Amino acid sequence: TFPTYKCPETFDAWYCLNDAHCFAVKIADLPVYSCECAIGFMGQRCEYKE
Numbered sequence: 001t002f003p004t005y006k007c008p009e010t011f012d013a014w015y016c017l018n019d020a021h022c023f024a025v026k027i028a029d030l031p032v033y034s035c036e037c038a039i040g041f042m043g044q045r046c047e048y049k050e
Helices: 009-014
Strands: 021-027 030-036
Touching: 009 021
Parallel strands: none
Antiparallel strands: 021 030
16 A cells, blocks of 8 residues: 655645545556545546546
């Protein structure tokens, strides 16, 4: 399991939608930012109301 970290500020502010939370991992020295969606939402930015 990869540890997760707080996102940089621009990502933390704007990237994840619909009350989703941004989280960062580092894979082979590269930061990858992702969104943990609230229930009922899906997508890269949790932009789709599933």
